[PDB]
Design a protein around this nucleic acid. Sequence first.
RNA 1: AAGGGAUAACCGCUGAAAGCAUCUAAGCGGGAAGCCCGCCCCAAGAUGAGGCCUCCCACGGCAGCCGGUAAGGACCC
RNA 2: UGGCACCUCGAUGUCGGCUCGUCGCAUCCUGGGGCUGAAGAAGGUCCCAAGGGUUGGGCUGUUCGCCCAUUAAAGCGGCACGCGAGCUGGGUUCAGAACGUCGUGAGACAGUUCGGUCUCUAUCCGCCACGGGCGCAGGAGGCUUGAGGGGGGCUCUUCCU
Lengths: 22, 140, 204, 37, 174
Amino acid sequence: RRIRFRPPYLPRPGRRPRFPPP
Amino acid sequence: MKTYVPKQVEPRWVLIDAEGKTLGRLATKIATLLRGKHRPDWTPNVAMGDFVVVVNADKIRVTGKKLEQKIYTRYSGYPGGLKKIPLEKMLATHPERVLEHAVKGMLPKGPLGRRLFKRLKVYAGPDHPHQAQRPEKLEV
Amino acid sequence: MKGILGVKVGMTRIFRDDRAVPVTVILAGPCPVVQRRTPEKDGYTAVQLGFLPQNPKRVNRPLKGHFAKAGVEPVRILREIRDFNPEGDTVTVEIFKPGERVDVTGTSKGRGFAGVMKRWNFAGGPDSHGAHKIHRHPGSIGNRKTPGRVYKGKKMAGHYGAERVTVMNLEVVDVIPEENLLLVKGAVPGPNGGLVIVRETKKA
Amino acid sequence: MKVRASVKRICDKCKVIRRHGRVYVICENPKHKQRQG
Amino acid sequence: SRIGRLPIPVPKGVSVEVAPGRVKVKGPKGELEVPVSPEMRVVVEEGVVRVERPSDERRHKSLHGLTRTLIANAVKGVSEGYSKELLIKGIGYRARLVGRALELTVGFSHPVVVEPPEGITFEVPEPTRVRVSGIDKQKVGQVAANIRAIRKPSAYHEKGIYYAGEPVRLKPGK
RNA sequence: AAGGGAUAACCGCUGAAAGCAUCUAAGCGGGAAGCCCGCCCCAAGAUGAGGCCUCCCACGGCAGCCGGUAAGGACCC
RNA sequence: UGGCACCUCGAUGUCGGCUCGUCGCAUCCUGGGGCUGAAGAAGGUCCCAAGGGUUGGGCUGUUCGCCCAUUAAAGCGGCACGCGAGCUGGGUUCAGAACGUCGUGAGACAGUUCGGUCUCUAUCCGCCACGGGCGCAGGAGGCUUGAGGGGGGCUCUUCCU
Ligand SMILES: [Mg+2]
Ligand SMILES: [Mg+2]
Ligand SMILES: [Mg+2]
Ligand SMILES: [Mg+2]
Ligand SMILES: [Mg+2]
Ligand SMILES: [Mg+2]
Ligand SMILES: [Mg+2]
Ligand SMILES: [Mg+2]
Ligand SMILES: [Mg+2]
Ligand SMILES: [Mg+2]
Ligand SMILES: [Mg+2]
Ligand SMILES: [Mg+2]
Ligand SMILES: [Mg+2]
Ligand SMILES: [Mg+2]
Ligand SMILES: [Mg+2]
Ligand SMILES: [Mg+2]
Ligand SMILES: [Mg+2]
Ligand SMILES: [Mg+2]
Ligand SMILES: [Mg+2]
Ligand SMILES: [Mg+2]
Ligand SMILES: [Mg+2]
Ligand SMILES: [Mg+2]
Ligand SMILES: [Mg+2]
Ligand SMILES: [Mg+2]
Ligand SMILES: [Mg+2]
Ligand SMILES: [Mg+2]
Ligand SMILES: [Mg+2]
Ligand SMILES: [Mg+2]
Ligand SMILES: [Mg+2]
Ligand SMILES: [Mg+2]
Ligand SMILES: [Mg+2]
Ligand SMILES: [Mg+2]
Ligand SMILES: [Mg+2]
Ligand SMILES: [Mg+2]
Ligand SMILES: [Mg+2]
Ligand SMILES: [Mg+2]
Ligand SMILES: [Mg+2]
Ligand SMILES: [Mg+2]
Ligand SMILES: [Mg+2]
Ligand SMILES: [Mg+2]
Ligand SMILES: [Mg+2]
Ligand SMILES: [Mg+2]
Ligand SMILES: [Mg+2]
Ligand SMILES: [Mg+2]
Ligand SMILES: [Mg+2]
Ligand SMILES: [Mg+2]
Ligand SMILES: [Mg+2]
Ligand SMILES: [Mg+2]
Ligand SMILES: [Mg+2]
Ligand SMILES: [Mg+2]
Ligand SMILES: [Mg+2]
Ligand SMILES: [Mg+2]
Ligand SMILES: [Mg+2]
Ligand SMILES: [Mg+2]
Ligand SMILES: [Mg+2]
Ligand SMILES: [Mg+2]
Ligand SMILES: [Mg+2]
Ligand SMILES: [Mg+2]
Ligand SMILES: [Mg+2]
Ligand SMILES: [Mg+2]
Ligand SMILES: [Mg+2]
Ligand SMILES: [Mg+2]
Ligand SMILES: [Mg+2]
Ligand SMILES: [Mg+2]
Ligand SMILES: [Mg+2]
Ligand SMILES: [Mg+2]
Ligand SMILES: [Mg+2]
Ligand SMILES: [Mg+2]
Ligand SMILES: [Mg+2]
Ligand SMILES: [Mg+2]
Ligand SMILES: [Mg+2]
Ligand SMILES: [Mg+2]
Ligand SMILES: [Mg+2]
Ligand SMILES: [Mg+2]
Ligand SMILES: [Mg+2]
Ligand SMILES: [Mg+2]
Ligand SMILES: [Mg+2]
Ligand SMILES: [Mg+2]
Ligand SMILES: [Mg+2]
Ligand SMILES: [Mg+2]
Ligand SMILES: [Mg+2]
Ligand SMILES: [Mg+2]
Ligand SMILES: [Mg+2]
Ligand SMILES: [Mg+2]
Ligand SMILES: [Mg+2]
Ligand SMILES: [Mg+2]
Ligand SMILES: [Mg+2]
Ligand SMILES: [Mg+2]
Ligand SMILES: [Mg+2]
Ligand SMILES: [Mg+2]
Ligand SMILES: [Mg+2]
Ligand SMILES: [Mg+2]
Ligand SMILES: [Mg+2]
Ligand SMILES: [Mg+2]
Ligand SMILES: [Mg+2]
Ligand SMILES: [Mg+2]
Ligand SMILES: [Mg+2]
Ligand SMILES: [Mg+2]
Ligand SMILES: [Zn+2]
């Protein structure tokens, strides 16, 4: 049980797909 | 000149009265009989040792407080599945396991070591079924 | 330590001292003894009982012979009661007397491939508030990297039922020897028609 | 029974006993009975 | 200072034959086998049994005295006999004899009946006095102990099963 | 659960070293929802592959192969 | 709570909840005890004990906490502060908007506020189930021993005395 509030290290997914490539 | 290797040899059946013998120290000897390492033609890659019959295992002997304190242990694979069974109880329920489990541990691991174990025939009480093999008595 | 083969026929209830008594009815006798197990010969003690008659046209030769040797006409089913040596060469329901208490084994109804909820009364999912396609799913099954694996016996969906269940300490409410009927109070594994075993109870 | 890592006599009547690989202190006054732990 | 060295008077006529690991003591009250260390030597002189330690090593000095007393006791037992008396104090409490056996009445919702083990004789002179009589010292003090335990002496009241010659030490209650 | 058994802390019987005392060094008791067993279920791949009952049997040609069977078995319904 | 900066920045998804649990014991309860400034009942304190148990509701994202009604008890902790290829997404990382504050300004805040895309397909190990094959020195049909495992293990009220 940790008090010092634990910030996220990561952004909640997610934005966009690299569609397409052809 | 290449080292000698035995052709197939017919294995000697040896018999040992365990009564009153110091468990572990009997155990090392049985292993050497088992591996074949008393034989001058010993070869590490084949079952060329003796068949050892032990009798009177119930009457194995042991130093210190091991009767009450040595704990044989079995793991089931389940949660909370460690079984701790103390030497007293073991002898009290499957006395032949005591010497067996001692000897097992002092043979090699591997397939051959496992086969060597199969050549150890251990019994509680004075008598054993291998009359057919006319086992040779050993004092060790 | 008596026992007997029998088929489950059904339930009703009877009235006894102004009370409804749910009962299962079991056709028990008559079961001819067809082998005995002895410590000299077998290493332990029990009767092999036969039960329900069989068309000898269906009895293969190895079996016909076993029956033969025991001087007994063919039977559908053979099952041993353990540590029981009846005086006679036939066990019937007479060996139970109303008021005795017994245990009954039978084979439970199959439920087939059952989910975690029917099998193990898991709590399943929410059905709203956002629950995404998990409403009868088992939830988590594990930890993380430690221990990084799943327990043996982790409760899970699988086959369920069509197993041996022994239900214990049921009251014999009545026995009807004219018909080989046993009325045990309460409920017994298996479908009406299932085969059951009735043994004298161990709970004391 | 007092249980501690210092068991000693308390009164003149106290008596240190060593019993089954443990050090107790028995005495006629029950308050003084000690085991070590 | 020494118990092993003191000799054991053997009254006429109790037999004391010695075998390895035991001495057998027979007398007018019956017999008793005494298990004894192989390490000690039990010596039978005229109407005296003596015991001898092999050295002055700690184990032996300890084994020494114990051995004497055990044989010494066995002797006294098969001759004189051994006993402990139990007093019963407390108001409603009293004991009577049922056949061979002891029935205790001590404040419970029931009596407590006590079986004589092999070799023990219960005797209830008054109803508030019980006598544990036997040939085995150890066995007697045992059964005695047991009976007493059925209702120990209270800490506040003179009440419960007492040993004859047991000090009534009580404490205040308010 | 009952019940049996062995134990924990704890309480003891007998008892020296240490003439007294000591539950301990010899030995013996009592003592937990806990431990072993007992209950219920699985289980001989328990390759250490167990046991009992019954059935078939010495079939043709050159610890091997081929063919027709035996007791049984599978296929199909 | 920190220190350090050792794998991992060609990604180890992070609060809380839900679900499923499993373990430790420094035990909340229930069993067994010693001492008590223990008359009784009740309770203090320590020892043994992890088998089982350990409630429902209001507040708030909250964990925590407070509170209501109970209770034998309403235990504390570990498992990537267990568990997002299991769900959630209330909270804390983006883009919008506003308040207080700071900045001339663009903007900013371990402040506040409303809103804000969570990915059908399991190769392997692991797990739950079910078969196929071969083996168990002759081939067969039945019936079994149980090595070894697994399951279970709670507790209250009243009355008699
Ligand atoms: Mg040699
Ligand atoms: Mg070589
Ligand atoms: Mg055995
Ligand atoms: Mg190696
Ligand atoms: Mg059945
Ligand atoms: Mg179905
Ligand atoms: Mg399901
Ligand atoms: Mg269910
Ligand atoms: Mg349901
Ligand atoms: Mg629910
Ligand atoms: Mg639901
Ligand atoms: Mg919902
Ligand atoms: Mg969604
Ligand atoms: Mg849905
Ligand atoms: Mg691992
Ligand atoms: Mg099925
Ligand atoms: Mg009727
Ligand atoms: Mg039905
Ligand atoms: Mg101090
Ligand atoms: Mg002093
Ligand atoms: Mg004293
Ligand atoms: Mg003399
Ligand atoms: Mg001399
Ligand atoms: Mg019990
Ligand atoms: Mg006992
Ligand atoms: Mg004494
Ligand atoms: Mg002194
Ligand atoms: Mg001792
Ligand atoms: Mg005992
Ligand atoms: Mg003891
Ligand atoms: Mg006692
Ligand atoms: Mg219980
Ligand atoms: Mg089976
Ligand atoms: Mg079975
Ligand atoms: Mg088999
Ligand atoms: Mg194995
Ligand atoms: Mg077989
Ligand atoms: Mg740090
Ligand atoms: Mg680094
Ligand atoms: Mg870092
Ligand atoms: Mg780092
Ligand atoms: Mg990184
Ligand atoms: Mg990559
Ligand atoms: Mg990578
Ligand atoms: Mg990646
Ligand atoms: Mg990962
Ligand atoms: Mg992940
Ligand atoms: Mg937990
Ligand atoms: Mg735990
Ligand atoms: Mg503790
Ligand atoms: Mg308590
Ligand atoms: Mg207390
Ligand atoms: Mg009180
Ligand atoms: Mg008071
Ligand atoms: Mg008071
Ligand atoms: Mg204490
Ligand atoms: Mg204590
Ligand atoms: Mg617990
Ligand atoms: Mg727990
Ligand atoms: Mg709430
Ligand atoms: Mg409301
Ligand atoms: Mg809250
Ligand atoms: Mg709200
Ligand atoms: Mg907030
Ligand atoms: Mg708060
Ligand atoms: Mg209370
Ligand atoms: Mg709560
Ligand atoms: Mg995580
Ligand atoms: Mg956690
Ligand atoms: Mg987490
Ligand atoms: Mg998580
Ligand atoms: Mg997710
Ligand atoms: Mg989460
Ligand atoms: Mg995950
Ligand atoms: Mg993952
Ligand atoms: Mg899920
Ligand atoms: Mg919000
Ligand atoms: Mg949000
Ligand atoms: Mg925004
Ligand atoms: Mg605003
Ligand atoms: Mg402003
Ligand atoms: Mg500011
Ligand atoms: Mg400004
Ligand atoms: Mg300004
Ligand atoms: Mg910045
Ligand atoms: Mg909206
Ligand atoms: Mg927001
Ligand atoms: Mg997702
Ligand atoms: Mg979604
Ligand atoms: Mg796919
Ligand atoms: Mg796969
Ligand atoms: Mg893998
Ligand atoms: Mg198979
Ligand atoms: Mg198959
Ligand atoms: Mg069949
Ligand atoms: Mg057998
Ligand atoms: Mg078993
Ligand atoms: Mg295995
Ligand atoms: Zn003192």
